[PDB]
Design a protein around this ligand. Sequence first.
Ligand SMILES: *[C@@H]1O[C@H](CO)[C@@H](O)[C@H](O)[C@H]1NC(C)=O
Lengths: 48, 48
Amino acid sequence: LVKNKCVNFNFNGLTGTGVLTESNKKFLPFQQFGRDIADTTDAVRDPQ
Amino acid sequence: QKLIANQFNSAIGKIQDSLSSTASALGKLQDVVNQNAQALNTLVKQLS
Ligand SMILES: *[C@@H]1O[C@H](CO)[C@@H](O)[C@H](O)[C@H]1NC(C)=O
C-alpha cells in the first residue's frame, strides 16, 4: 500500500478510489469497515 | 432625560439577558439550516 496518494484500492472485494491516510484516531475493536452519517465508507482495516 | 436614559439602558440589559438565557430564540434561522441539511442528506441517501 502507498499512502497520501490518489490510488485505486481493493480490500477483500470492496472497490473505490481515493487517498488512504493514517487514521489512528478511529478505534475498531473487532469491526472491519467504517461508515459515516451519509452511509459511505470512510475507514477500512488492512487485512494484511 | 434621566428617566428616559435609565429606561433605555434597562431595556438593553433586559434584552441582552433574554437573548443569553432562552435557547429557542433563533428558530427562524436554525430552520433553514436544518431543512437544507435534511435535503442534502436525503439526496445522498438516494444513492443506495
Ligand atoms: C503476518 O503479518 C505480519 C505483519 O508484519 C508479518 O510479519 C508476518 O510474516 C505475517 N505472517 C505470515 C505467515 O506471513
